[PDB]
Every structure is written in C-alpha cells, then in structure tokens.
Symmetry: C2
Subunit: 90 residues, 2 copies
C-alpha cells in the first residue's frame, strides 16, 4: 500500500546515503555512517530522523533483517568469520 | 540432507552459546572458531563440513536465522535501535 511505498523510499534513501557515507569516510564507523545516513535521508524526503529509523525498523520486521543488510552492503561479522574459516579450510 | 544440516547448525549454535558463556569477554571470532571445532569434534567430521553446512543453511533459510540461534545482533542494527531510542 501507500505505507509500504513510503517505507521503501525512506529505506532506499537511507541505504544510498549509508553506502555513500561509507565511501566518503572509509575510516569512519558503522555508527558514524548510520547517523549521517539518517540525517541525510531525513532531509531529502523532508521527514524527521525518527521517521527514518521508524521505516528501517518496520522494513526489518516485515522483510527481514538480512534484507535490510543486503541493501546496506553489510555482511555481519560472524559470517565474515565463517567465510574466513571457509577460506582457511579450503 | 535437510536433517544433516539442521543438526550441524544446532551443534554449532549451542557450542557458540557455550563458548560465549565460557569466554564472556572474548570476541565473536573466538566463539565462532571454538564452535566450528567443537561441532566438528562432536560429529567426527572436518571443519570444512561445518562451515559449508553453515553457509548452505544461511543461503536456504536466510542470514538472520542463524544469528537468532547465536543470540547475535548485527552491529548496524544495534546502532539503528540506539538512534530510535534517542529519537524517542
């Protein structure tokens, strides 16, 4: 519905800004990038920062946590270690 | 095939929780490596079979399902929820 569309737009703007913040500030932290991205997506759509994390939370619950993570380009550390062991063994 | 992978994931998951209890100040990498060797020892199998079964389970069932069993929340989602707490 229209609510799904509003969520998708905020999620996409946040994921675009997060990937861009990671690119521009490579030595930053995931928290730094997420905070920049929330600020950025909020000013684009003309929404609050609360509205941004609201949508990200709704997206995670309705689509899955891994779905949001795929759009951010994030592999959880535990899988990074599983792939490293996989490479070590193989 | 399905039963073989779900049982390996079970062993790895409880070995991970166990390692996290025995090494509470350890890192996630130390726990995962302990659990891979643990599950391999329990079933008399190789380390490569364990992480392959993990990767296959994660691909068919999703990434966050294995993490739910580990009791691990990705760092980025702890960040999001921290911001949501602040905006509240």
């Amino acid at each position: 519905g229209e609510e799904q569309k509003e969520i998708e737009t905020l999620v996409e703007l946040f994921a675009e800004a997060f990937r861009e913040a990671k690119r521009q500030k490579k030595n930053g932290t995931p928290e730094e990038w997420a905070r920049d991205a929330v600020e950025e997506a909020a000013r684009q759509q003309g929404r609050s920062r609360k509205d941004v994390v609201e949508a990200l939370t709704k997206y995670a619950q309705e689509q899955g946590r891994d779905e949001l993570l795929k759009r951010l380009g994030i592999t959880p550390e535990i899988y990074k270690v599983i792939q490293q062991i996989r490479k070590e063994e193989g």
